[PDB]
């Protein structure tokens, strides 16, 4: 089993506990570590922080530590765009350009692999043939890390990729079988299923439809997008299934209505360290005051609800939930968003440190037999 996890290049910007630096990831919480986000200049793989590589020294010196660690680095994200993936895939010539920058920039900074992380090709701004190029960029960066490792003798660069579980973005700009065949392995994002920009609470990562939906409403859960990733062709020991620890709020129009699909007039209010409306980290709802919790039966995820806010989230017993769901469709592992989501630092929750990542590394079966620090829940 893999157990892939994400650090964030701007989770060194937070505020006091919430404050997150290499120095705070664990070596062996997981099996892949993955960097996001790296950028791109002149078609090129470029960092995007000011202290990038300070950090991916950090990051990568993880592996004294524990040899078995691998690294990525992603590229793209959610404010990246589409244009520079665009501009970069339209020509062989621009193709070449990027696969060499990134072959260069990886081993020069000790990383294993990347990860692809368009948002999305086909969609949000980006041209129907960019569905197609994507699966040559895949294949061209496949073939030149299978080459670059014969030509070197070092271990092979893994590629790997962020995808979405919409059918609408899988339609929009994935092959998915031809990818699959060129992927080492795929991240599958099996979040963000709802969220405050529709106007009734939905959940952020149900793992089953809910009785009432219908349409294409029923398959914006984990179970279909699962089922229909495999059924387009990736092989189940590829799909890595993602795990938010981080959830979704609203702010309900009363406080008297607090049913999933229950009326919502916008954003639920920013959490105190994430700062973002509509988020809240996993930290920032586990020791909410006043607050009551609850159970979306059918879907077998919590949310919470205080006043007239209301949050859609990920606990210890939906990712054990959803680590045995992988396991009985045969998953490679899971994936997690993000590392500095999770209560890190054991400083909000009561849990101990990475309450929820280690849930997913114990029922995955990976605690380390050599471990000694480590927390079961
Ligand atoms: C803008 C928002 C809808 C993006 N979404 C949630 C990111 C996020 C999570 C928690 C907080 Br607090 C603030 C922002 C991302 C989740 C992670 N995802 C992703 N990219 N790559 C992987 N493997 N997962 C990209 C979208």
């Known amino acids: 089993a893999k157990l892939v996890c994400y650090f964030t290049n701007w989770a060194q910007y937070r505020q006091g506990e919430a404050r997150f630096l290499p120095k705070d ?70 193709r070449q350009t990027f696969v060499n920058s ?14 692809l992380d368009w948002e999305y090709p086909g969609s949000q701004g980006s041209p129907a043939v960019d569905k197609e190029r994507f699966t040559t960029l895949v294949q061209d960066l496949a073939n030149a890390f299978q080459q670059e490792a014969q030509t070197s003798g070092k271990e092979r660069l893994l590629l790997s990729a962020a995808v979405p579980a919409g059918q609408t973005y899988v ?8 990818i699959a065949q060129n992927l ?36 914006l859960n984990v179970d279909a997008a699962v089922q229909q990733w495999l059924q387009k062709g990736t092989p189940a020991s590829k799909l890595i299934l993602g795990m938010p620890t981080y959830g979704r709020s609203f702010t309900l129009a009363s406080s008297s209505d607090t049913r999933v699909g229950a009326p919502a007039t916008g954003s639920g209010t920013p959490g105190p360290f994430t700062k973002e409306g509509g988020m809240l980290a996993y930290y920032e709802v586990c020791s909410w005051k006043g607050a009551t919790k609850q159970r979306i039966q059918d879907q077998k995820v919590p949310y919470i609800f205080r006043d007239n806010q209301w ?31 999770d209560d890190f630092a054991g400083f909000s929750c009561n849990q101990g440190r990475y309450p929820l990542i280690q849930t997913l590394r114990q029922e995955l079966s990976l605690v380390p037999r050599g471990s000694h620090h480590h927390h079961h829940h």
């Not at 990134?102 to 990860?115: E, N, V």
């Not at 599958?188 to 149900?206: I, R």
């Not at 769901?325 to 500095?340: E, F, I, N, S």
Request: glycine share 8%.
């Open 25 to 94: 990831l664990d070596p062996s919480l997981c099996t892949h570590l993955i960097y996001a986000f790296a950028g791109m200049t002149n078609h090129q793989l470029s960092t995007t922080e000011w202290n990038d590589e300070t950090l991916y020294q950090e990051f990568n010196g993880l592996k004294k530590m524990n040899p078995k660690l691998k690294t990525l680095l992603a590229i793209g994200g959610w404010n990246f765009g589409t244009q520079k993936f665009t501009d970069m895939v339209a020509t062989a010539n621009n």
């Open 102 to 115: 990134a072959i260069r920039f990886l081993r020069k900074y000790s990383f294993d692999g990347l990860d």
């Open 171 to 178: 339609d929009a700009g994935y092959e998915v079988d031809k």
């Open 184 to 219: 080492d392995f795929v991240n599958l994002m099996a979040y963000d299923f709802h969220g405050s920009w529709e106007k009734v609470t939905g959940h952020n990562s149900p793992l089953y439809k809910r009785q009432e939906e219908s349409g294409a409403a029923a398959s």
């Open 311 to 341: 949050v859609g989230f990920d606990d210890v017993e939906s990712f054990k939930t959803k680590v045995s769901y992988l396991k009985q469709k045969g998953l490679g592992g899971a994936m997690v968003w993000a590392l500095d989501l």
